[PDB]
Design an enzyme around this catalytic site. Structure first.
Site, PDB file in Angstrom:
ATOM      1  N   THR A 148       0.836  -1.250   0.000  1.00 22.92           N
ATOM      2  CA  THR A 148       0.000   0.000   0.000  1.00 22.92           C
ATOM      3  C   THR A 148       0.854   1.277   0.000  1.00 22.92           C
ATOM      4  OG1 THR A 148      -1.939  -1.070   1.011  1.00 22.92           O
ATOM      5  CG2 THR A 148      -1.823   1.320   1.264  1.00 22.92           C
TER       6      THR A 148
HETATM    7  B1  LIG Z   1      -1.992  -2.143   1.975  1.00 27.47           B
HETATM    8  O1  LIG Z   1      -1.693  -1.716   3.423  1.00 27.47           O
HETATM    9  O2  LIG Z   1      -0.955  -3.199   1.557  1.00 27.47           O
HETATM   10  C1  LIG Z   1      -3.487  -2.740   1.869  1.00 27.47           C
HETATM   11  C2  LIG Z   1      -4.530  -1.683   2.289  1.00 27.47           C
HETATM   12  C3  LIG Z   1      -5.984  -2.157   2.436  1.00 27.47           C
HETATM   13  C4  LIG Z   1      -6.870  -0.972   2.790  1.00 27.47           C
HETATM   14  C5  LIG Z   1      -6.543  -2.828   1.190  1.00 27.47           C
HETATM   15  N1  LIG Z   1      -3.679  -3.936   2.689  1.00 27.47           N
HETATM   16  C6  LIG Z   1      -3.581  -5.205   2.270  1.00 27.47           C
HETATM   17  O3  LIG Z   1      -3.299  -5.506   1.123  1.00 27.47           O
HETATM   18  C7  LIG Z   1      -3.865  -6.310   3.244  1.00 27.47           C
HETATM   19  C8  LIG Z   1      -3.079  -7.409   3.582  1.00 27.47           C
HETATM   20  N2  LIG Z   1      -3.773  -8.130   4.474  1.00 27.47           N
HETATM   21  C9  LIG Z   1      -3.564  -9.360   5.237  1.00 27.47           C
HETATM   22  C10 LIG Z   1      -2.370 -10.143   4.711  1.00 27.47           C
HETATM   23  N3  LIG Z   1      -1.115  -9.618   5.222  1.00 27.47           N
HETATM   24  C11 LIG Z   1       0.048 -10.265   5.080  1.00 27.47           C
HETATM   25  O4  LIG Z   1       0.146 -11.352   4.521  1.00 27.47           O
HETATM   26  C12 LIG Z   1       1.295  -9.657   5.662  1.00 27.47           C
HETATM   27  C13 LIG Z   1       2.473  -9.478   4.911  1.00 27.47           C
HETATM   28  O5  LIG Z   1       2.524  -9.831   3.583  1.00 27.47           O
HETATM   29  C14 LIG Z   1       2.277  -8.831   2.594  1.00 27.47           C
HETATM   30  C15 LIG Z   1       3.610  -8.912   5.519  1.00 27.47           C
HETATM   31  O6  LIG Z   1       4.760  -8.730   4.784  1.00 27.47           O
HETATM   32  C16 LIG Z   1       5.628  -9.831   4.512  1.00 27.47           C
HETATM   33  C17 LIG Z   1       3.572  -8.534   6.876  1.00 27.47           C
HETATM   34  O7  LIG Z   1       4.677  -7.985   7.485  1.00 27.47           O
HETATM   35  C18 LIG Z   1       4.635  -6.691   8.094  1.00 27.47           C
HETATM   36  C19 LIG Z   1       2.396  -8.727   7.622  1.00 27.47           C
HETATM   37  C20 LIG Z   1       1.267  -9.288   7.018  1.00 27.47           C
HETATM   38  N4  LIG Z   1      -4.998  -7.538   4.746  1.00 27.47           N
HETATM   39  N5  LIG Z   1      -5.020  -6.391   3.943  1.00 27.47           N
END
Ligand SMILES: *[B]([O])([O])[C]([C][C]([C])[C])[N]C(=O)C1=[C]N([C][C][N]C(=O)C2=C(O[C])C(O[C])=C(O[C])[C]=[C]2)N=N1
Ligand SMILES: *[B]([O])([O])[C]([C][C]([C])[C])[N]C(=O)C1=[C]N([C][C][N]C(=O)C2=C(O[C])C(O[C])=C(O[C])[C]=[C]2)N=N1
Ligand SMILES: *[B]([O])([O])[C]([C][C]([C])[C])[N]C(=O)C1=[C]N([C][C][N]C(=O)C2=C(O[C])C(O[C])=C(O[C])[C]=[C]2)N=N1
Ligand code: NA
Ligand code: NA
Ligand code: NA
Ligand code: NA
Ligand code: NA
Ligand code: NA
Lengths: 199, 197, 214, 218, 203, 204, 213, 196, 199
Positions: free
Chosen positions: A1
């Protein structure tokens, strides 16, 4: 994001990317992250999608009724505090950052950050994973007293620069320009992104 | 660590418990009694964690006694056993789970003799014979060998002797003396405690 | 707050003749990241008292909101009674301890400057409710760098003037900018005297990097 | 422990406190943390006391071997290289934080050497549990090309700020000025802090069961 | 800690050591590890000092409150049962408490080992604390049901003394009581090391 | 803890033309005491003794391995070892096990066989020497021994005054430690004589 | 993770004479290897005939002192008299035990006068086990001071020594010399020495200096 | 779990071991012998982890026997004990640490009788009496009570009886029978196994 | 840490910050991170100081002797491979990134990255903690065919922008310009850093 809000004379420009990630997988490549709270107040969604939407729904519900109880449009300071207090109260439980911005009859165009239940008015702010990579650019490229068009250029350039580098950011750039006159929504596609060095 | 055994007959139920009240490495009491009188024709034999056994057993005992006073007749061994199961099953997924292993031996006038088995999980099983503790691992196969459904009580004590003597020969824990009781038509009957050299 | 996000670094403090002075850089650090380089970590409590805060900025902003309202609530009555510097420090010790004792602490370490009834007040309070008074204070990493320099001068001259105290504090924030990684060269000084609470800023220290040619 | 170093016009000054702590108990009140390496090279000991002791011992022997073979007064760059490559092979398990100071052919030199094997050439530095107090004093009042008198005063003030400020640090300031013409080891250069006592027990108050006397006769 | 208690012909002996010990350091050389609830009821103590002190003082409160309500002194069975119920309500909480409740009532001389788990054992002889095992050795070897009052005191005194000799976390002074039909009597607060020096010199 | 498994207590002390060294007699394994005459102080010459606290197997091993090297030194060199030399031999011996050390904290006490001036020191488990002009302690009751020593010690004490000081310092320290005591032993090292005594200590 | 305790240190001490009660402490407050403050004495006045020393975690010390101060009033309001020294020590046990499962990390030593006029010291552990004593040390240097107090006040391991009671002159000098010895060897003991002396006339406070490093 | 005991006299050493070879919950052997003949006037009693005891004890046994064959005279109890200590101390900080607890009882012609004690750490301690196992926690205080330095061997067996009878009364493990042996001027002497 | 190397017609510009951190503590605020390997070959040190120096010493030793064995100055590809192979071999053990750059008679001015034992020639590269914050700026501000002065400006701007945002980066900017003519060392102080938006 990657999200970004910018402040000017009589309005705010507000921009996001469109990638909803699930690790290496892209769940949604065309997600609008600029959600309306009121007629002339938006918030830029970031972090956990489930957390970010639920706060935006609850803030919208609260601000709708608050607006009707005053017989006026809500202040952006009020909408920033509504998002702040929710984010602060459930800070352990929620994992989202809702940047709030809009327009008032009183204080005009204004941008607020609510990172982990804090509150701070800035001339510009950036958030999400891709904001990390563009702190140098926004420090370099920002100067005060920009027009609507200069702000829309700057918001596109910064979010495009981040989308190039950040894996979690990508897709299209959604843009919102809020003034007294109204709300101008615009979608800069992945086809027509501003090119820079990318090798 | 402790040890229980029950042997159902045609018209009776023999039972026996050890008499060691253990603590750390020390045998604090050689004369401890692990059987609890529920009714005139029912014994609850109880073994497990130190404070859990007596607190659970006595809670059941008093409610079985309350059933007698309230209605002018005691619970059957079937009723008493499922009551014991219902309490232990409700405590299982709660703040205070009782880690207790137990036998409920009894005699109904209609249904005849009955020996019930129950682990700390509260699985109820009617059995012709059963046993609890690490001693059960040695002694259960002796019961498979020599038990028949038509076993006489005087022979059933000599069968019990072979189980208890096997514990002295092979089981690493001491367990020198054992309580012994029979239930039939005429209620509970004390018998001589099977001591050793 | 179990895990803080946007932390502020050291808050300094020292008593002088007819007043107290505190200093704190205007940085909110998101770990290593200098995110917010223009935020006031000092607060005007009332006419008699001021409050600077290290640690999490959202918890400080909550305390700013709660205190501000308490001072508003007091000033409604208007009955010639005010919270002294010691009284706010006493309340704030009980606030942090109560939150500590519920295992939900406000992640802050704070310095309370004040002047009332002729006397200068300088008071420490941390997230656990550890509190005391001293002639100088330095929270966070400033405890190890800046507090040595304040105690060095206060041994040789116990009673300082405002200009002696201000030029000392400017010398301390120079050392913090050099040696603290989580500091910045924007800061505010806040004095309190008979006149009331002044908050001067943004300021900067004149640096020197001539040792790089050796 | 508060140890520190300082480059001035005619030479280098090295400072150190005298407290040695075992956990949170003071084991030694008076000990020398400024160790000999060469005639015009000394080294301050911090971190693990045995590792600080034995590395400075070992490099001193290596410099004696190196000086005897070369027929020359040893270079301060050489002690830093030997320490580094010793300390780097042991991956920080030899926990010797060291300030290495001296004069040679190429002038006055001061090096900070950390236990993992990193180093830094500097004009002033500090190490040990009260490094920050001493380093704060140096940053406040250091300038290039100090006098012999001003450097002693500043370096005493740095180590003193640690002595008072740091619970690990305590006691007297040892010091070592290394000018061009030799090295002046100013042991007990300062004393920041200043009883009744007397618990005279009568002979026979201690009860005794066994007694054996072994005469020696020279 | 080392506590012991045994019945014999002339009532019940109850002997305890006095050492308190936070880690290897000796917190206190002389702690009183017997509570005097009334003239006809004692309580030994072992394990966590604060648990022992609080919960046996709360027993005493309820025993005193039993006297006022019913107009008669509490039985040794009822008092031992009431303490075990307090321990049953705080099971799994990490309370450490290893008392023996000694007394005299209508039922005769009474002795009850009561425990942090909820354990509650009526018996002739008991011992608790870290020195538990060493006390049993001396006590069991020299025991008879038909000891004299003086020979009973010699057994209890020696058993605590030889336990403190071996167990690091027991020491100080032997505090020996004697229960009778007409209430308890404090026998002695003898020093242990002086007794161990005395027994060494006898050989 | 490792040092507290067997426990123990060792102390050394200075006077005018004399040194004292002393230690408790408890060998135990955690709670259980095993014997009450376990040697913790060992001779390394006529006017030079070494005291070893902590883990009992390493107390004995380091004593034996130090005697091995001592006897080789005395034969090679053709003399009694100097006290400062024995410290460095222990320091070398212990630091050889830097990353796998003997769990013992030695305390040396002796007179210089040429000049007869008093010497004391102690070392940590990895062999870092610490020379003092007053006293040195090592054991599970180090804190207790320090507090006695600091208060009771005076400079320039005669052999009889030194004995009373070091004995009362040991006795009262080990009486506030569960895993030290069961007797004390004290050696008064003088020029003319060695005066070894065992005290009427607490046996609990 | 979040740790609700921290060791601030300092030493406390109390002695009970025939007609008096000393309760003393250092003034150093520490955290980690830095000094918080040099003027933080651990003696707190409760009544005219009772004073308490409190050392350990300072957040609990401030709170627990404020609790005792609050409870003293509540008793006096109910019963129309000051709490006796023994009644405070009994009450303190219940307050410390009420937090059995989240301790007040505070080593308490009360010292003052019993109803019979004489000296009375009560020593504690953090969860509220207590006893009456003649003397007790507590806090950081507990281990250093206690065996010397066992020796000089208790007359332990001494023979041909007449067991004379402690004069207030002698006890005051002892308290100075032990806290001098603690200050030397303990990092957490130092700066200055508060000594409160409780006699029937009242409380009076001295302040001897200690090592400031 | 297992149990050893030794009682030194004026001119002898009494010793005794239990005879349970345990496995999980089962008492596999009631007649097991835990004493190992080092010399004509030395016994090594050994207890611990299952395979460690016999492998260690036998390694020592054969090296003590090798000392006899090489030199035409056996090791003294002092020499044998420090040899046992030296091997166990060297294995302690190595790949193969033997978890063994042991008593070395013996008789020298010059020095007289000797009972030595050793834990798995290899701390050697000469003692007038000692014991290993959880049974030692019950029985050591009985030895403190009734032992004197001038105890006769026939009385010392009656002292041993009180320790072994205390294990039957109070110790939760069975341990029904015990090996018993005396060493003096005339070497090792078997005695009747104290059964119950 | 922030490091940066830039490539041009007949040379390379090479820049670092000067902060040696130990968590929140600054151990050394004036550390030169541009170490010479040969007369016209430098490397920009980053990550673990002990690891980074030891590789630079070993690379310098290896390249000194290698240079004498050829009777020529070593190639920058050779010095890049010497640093690569060490970093690769002990990649588990070492935690440092040595960016290598210099000049040759053959291939001229050239910049190489050796991140975790890899090898890649880039027109510019950036490394250390502060490089994270300036990926947007360097993509935006880089264009090809820059002079020595344009490269020195760009390297100062980027490292100053990073030093503003990164806590672990700070102090002075050390600069090295390597050509056929020689090595121009220069120290841009903390006093005279190029100002940007910093609020
Ligand atoms: B954006 O913040 O990327 C976006 C914004 C929303 C309003 C649509 N959010 C998302 O895309 C998102 C991701 N998730 C849950 C899944 N998360 C993870 O898998 C995750 C990851 O992988 C990307 C990582 O990085 C390796 C971390 O580390 C900090 C934690 C969680 N829900 N919405
Ligand atoms: B007695 O049980 O020793 C005694 C009896 C009271 C009535 C005074 N109780 C205490 O002294 C006592 C001890 N403690 C808490 C301290 N516990 C420990 O130090 C500890 C110890 O050491 C004894 C050990 O043993 C090694 C363990 O390991 C299991 C754990 C804790 N409060 N009161
Ligand atoms: B630069 O890369 O910051 C710089 C470059 C050198 C060539 C001078 N290196 C250093 O400043 C440096 C830092 N350290 C050791 C200290 N380690 C860390 O700071 C560190 C930490 O601690 C905050 C953490 O997390 C806690 C991680 O993540 C696991 C990594 C490093 N030596 N030299
Ligand atoms: Na992308
Ligand atoms: Na002791
Ligand atoms: Na004991
Ligand atoms: Na001190
Ligand atoms: Na200090
Ligand atoms: Na920075």
């Amino acid at each position: 994001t990657t999200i970004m809000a910018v402040e000017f004379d009589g309005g705010v420009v507000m921009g996001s990317d469109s990638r909803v990630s699930a690790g290496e997988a892209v769940v949604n490549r065309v997600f609008d992250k600029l959600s309306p709270l009121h007629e002339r107040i938006y918030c830029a969604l970031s972090g956990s999608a489930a957390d970010a939407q639920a706060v935006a729904d609850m803030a919208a519900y609260q601000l709708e009724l608050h607006g009707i109880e005053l017989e006026e449009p809500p202040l952006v300071l009020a909408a920033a505090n509504v998002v702040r207090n929710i984010s602060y109260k459930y800070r352990e439980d929620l994992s989202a950052h809702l940047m709030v911005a809009g327009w008032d009859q009183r204080e005009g165009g204004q941008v607020y950050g609510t990172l982990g239940g804090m509150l701070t008015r800035q001339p510009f702010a950036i958030g999400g994973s891709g904001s990390t990579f563009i702190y140098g650019y926004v420090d370099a490229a920002y100067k005060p007293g920009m027009s609507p068009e200069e702000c829309r250029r700057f918001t596109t350039d910064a979010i495009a620069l981040a989308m190039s580098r950040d894996g979690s950011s990508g897709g299209v750039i959604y843009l919102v320009t809020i003034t007294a006159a109204g709300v101008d929504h615009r979608v800069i596609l992945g086809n027509e992104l501003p090119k820079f060095y990318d090798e | 660590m402790e040890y229980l055994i029950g042997i159902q007959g045609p018209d009776y139920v023999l039972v026996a418990s050890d008499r060691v009240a253990a603590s750390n490495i020390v045998q604090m009491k050689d004369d401890h009694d692990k059987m609890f009188k529920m009714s005139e024709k029912i014994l609850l034999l109880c073994v497990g964690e130190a404070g859990d056994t007596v607190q659970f057993a006595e809670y059941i005992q008093k409610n079985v006694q309350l059933y007698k006073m309230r209605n002018g007749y005691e619970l059957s061994p079937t009723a008493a056993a499922n009551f014991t199961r219902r309490n232990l099953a409700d405590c299982l997924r709660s703040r205070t789970p009782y880690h207790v292993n137990l036998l409920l031996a009894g005699y109904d006038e209609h249904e005849g003799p009955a020996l019930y088995y129950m682990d700390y999980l509260a699985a109820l099983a009617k059995a012709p014979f059963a046993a609890h503790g690490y001693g059960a691992f040695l002694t259960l196969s002796i019961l498979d060998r020599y038990y028949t459904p038509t076993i006489s009580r005087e022979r059933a004590v000599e069968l019990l002797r072979k189980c208890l003597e096997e514990l002295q020969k092979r089981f690493i824990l001491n367990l020198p003396t054992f309580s012994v009781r029979i239930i039939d038509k005429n209620g509970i009957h004390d018998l001589d405690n099977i001591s050793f050299p | 707050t179990q895990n803080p996000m946007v932390t502020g670094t050291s808050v300094l403090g020292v008593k002088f003749e007819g007043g107290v002075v505190i200093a704190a850089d205007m940085l909110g650090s998101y770990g290593s990241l200098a995110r917010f380089r223009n935020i006031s970590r000092i607060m005007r409590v009332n006419n008699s008292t001021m409050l600077g805060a290290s640690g999490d900025y959202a918890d400080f902003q909550y305390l700013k909101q709660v205190l501000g309202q308490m001072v508003i609530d007091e000033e409604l009555l208007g009955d010639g009674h005010s919270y002294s510097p010691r009284a706010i420090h006493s309340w704030l010790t009980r606030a942090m301890y109560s939150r500590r004792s519920k295992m939900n602490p406000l992640w802050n370490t704070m310095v309370i400057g004040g002047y009332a009834d002729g006397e200068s007040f300088l008071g420490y309070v941390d997230m656990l409710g550890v509190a005391y008074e001293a002639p100088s204070l330095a929270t966070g990493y400033g405890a190890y760098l800046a507090q040595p320099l304040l105690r060095e001068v206060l041994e040789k001259q116990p009673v300082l003037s405002q200009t002696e105290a201000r030029d000392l504090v400017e010398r301390c924030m120079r050392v913090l900018y050099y040696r603290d990684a989580r500091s910045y060269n924007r800061f505010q000084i806040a004095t309190v005297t008979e006149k009331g609470v002044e908050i001067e800023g943004p300021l900067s220290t004149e640096t020197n990097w001539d040792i790089a040619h050796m | 422990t508060t140890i520190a170093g300082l480059v001035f016009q005619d030479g280098v000054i090295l400072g150190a406190d005298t407290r040695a702590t075992n956990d949170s108990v003071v084991a030694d009140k008076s000990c020398e943390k400024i160790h000999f390496i060469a005639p015009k090279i000394y080294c301050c000991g911090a971190g693990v006391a045995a590792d600080a002791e034995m590395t400075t011992r070992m490099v001193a022997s290596k410099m004696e071997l190196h000086a005897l073979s070369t027929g020359r007064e040893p270079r301060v760059a050489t002690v830093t290289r030997i320490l580094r490559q010793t300390l780097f092979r042991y991956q920080g398990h030899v926990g010797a934080s060291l300030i290495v100071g001296g004069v040679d052919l190429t002038g006055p030199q001061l090096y900070g050497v950390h236990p993992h094997g990193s180093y830094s050439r500097l004009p002033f530095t500090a190490l040990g549990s009260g490094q920050d107090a001493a380093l704060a004093v140096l940053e406040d009042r250091f300038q290039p090309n100090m006098t012999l008198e001003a450097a002693q005063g500043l370096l005493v003030e740095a180590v003193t700020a640690g002595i008072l400020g740091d619970l690990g640090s305590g006691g007297n300031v040892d010091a070592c000025v290394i000018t061009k013409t030799g090295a002046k080891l100013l042991r007990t250069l300062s004393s920041p802090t200043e009883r009744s006592g007397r618990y005279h027990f009568v002979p026979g108050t201690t009860a005794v069961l066994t007694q054996t006397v072994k005469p020696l006769t020279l | 800690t080392t506590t012991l208690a045994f019945k014999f012909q002339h009532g019940v002996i109850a002997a305890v050591d006095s050492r308190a010990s936070a880690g290897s350091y000796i917190s206190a050389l002389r702690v009183n590890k017997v509570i005097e609830i009334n003239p006809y009821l004692l309580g030994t103590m072992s394990g966590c000092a604060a648990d022992c002190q609080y919960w046996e003082r709360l027993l005493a409160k309820e025993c005193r409150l039993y006297y006022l309500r019913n107009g008669e002194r509490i039985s040794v069975s009822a008092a031992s049962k009431l303490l075990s119920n307090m321990m049953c309500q705080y099971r799994g909480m990490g309370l450490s408490m290893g008392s023996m409740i000694c007394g005299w009532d209508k039922k005769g001389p009474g002795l009850y080992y009561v425990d942090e788990h909820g354990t509650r054992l009526s018996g002739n002889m008991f011992s608790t604390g870290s020195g538990n095992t060493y006390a049993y050795g001396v006590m069991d070897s020299g025991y008879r049901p038909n000891l004299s009052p003086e020979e009973a005191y010699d057994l209890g005194r020696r058993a605590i003394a030889y336990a403190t000799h071996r167990d690091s976390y027991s020491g100080g002074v032997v505090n020996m009581y004697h229960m009778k039909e007409d209430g308890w009597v404090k026998v002695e607060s003898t020093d242990v090391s002086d007794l161990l020096h005395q027994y060494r010199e006898a050989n | 803890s490792i040092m507290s498994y067997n426990g123990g207590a060792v102390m050394a002390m200075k006077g005018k033309n004399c040194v004292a060294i002393a230690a408790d007699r408890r060998f135990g394994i955690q709670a259980q005491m095993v014997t009450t005459d376990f040697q913790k102080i060992f001779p390394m010459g006529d006017r030079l003794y070494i005291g070893l606290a902590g883990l009992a197997t390493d107390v004995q091993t380091v004593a034996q391995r130090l005697k091995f090297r001592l006897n080789l030194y005395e034969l090679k060199e053709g003399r009694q070892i100097k006290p400062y030399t024995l410290m460095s031999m222990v320091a070398n011996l212990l630091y050889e096990k830097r990353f796998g050390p003997y769990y013992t904290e030695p305390v040396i006490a002796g007179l210089d066989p040429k000049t007869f001036k008093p010497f004391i020191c102690s070392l940590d488990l990895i062999g870092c020497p610490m020379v003092t002009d007053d006293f040195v302690v090592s054991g599970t009751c180090a804190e207790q021994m320090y507090g006695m020593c600091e208060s009771l010690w005076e400079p320039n004490m005669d052999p009889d005054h030194l004995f009373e000081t070091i004995s009362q310092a040991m006795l009262n320290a080990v009486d506030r430690d569960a895993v030290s005591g069961m007797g004390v032993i004290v050696h008064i090292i003088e020029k003319d004589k060695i005066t070894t005594r065992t005290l009427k200590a607490r046996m609990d | 993770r979040f740790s609700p305790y921290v060791f601030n240190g300092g030493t406390i001490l109390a002695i009970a004479g025939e007609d008096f009660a000393i309760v003393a402490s250092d003034t150093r407050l520490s955290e980690g290897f830095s000094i918080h403050t040099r003027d933080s004495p651990k003696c707190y006045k409760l009544t005219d005939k009772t004073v308490i020393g409190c050392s350990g975690f300072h957040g609990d010390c401030l709170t627990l002192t404020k609790i005792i101060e609050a409870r003293l009033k509540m008793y006096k309001h109910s019963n129309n008299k000051a709490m006796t020294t023994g009644a405070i020590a009994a009450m303190l046990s219940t307050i410390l035990y009420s937090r059995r499962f989240f301790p007040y990390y505070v080593y308490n030593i009360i010292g003052g006068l019993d109803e019979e006029g004489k000296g009375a010291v009560y020593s504690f552990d953090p969860v509220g086990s207590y006893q009456r004593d003649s003397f007790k040390a507590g806090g950081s240097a507990s281990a250093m001071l206690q065996p010397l107090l066992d020796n000089q006040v208790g007359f332990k391991n001494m023979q041909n020594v007449e067991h004379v009671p402690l004069s207030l002159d002698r006890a005051m000098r002892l308290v100075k010399d032990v806290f001098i010895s603690a200050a030397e060897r303990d990092v957490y003991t130092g700066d200055a020495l508060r000594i409160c002396i409780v006699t029937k006339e009242g409380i009076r406070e001295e302040t001897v200096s200690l090592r400031k490093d």
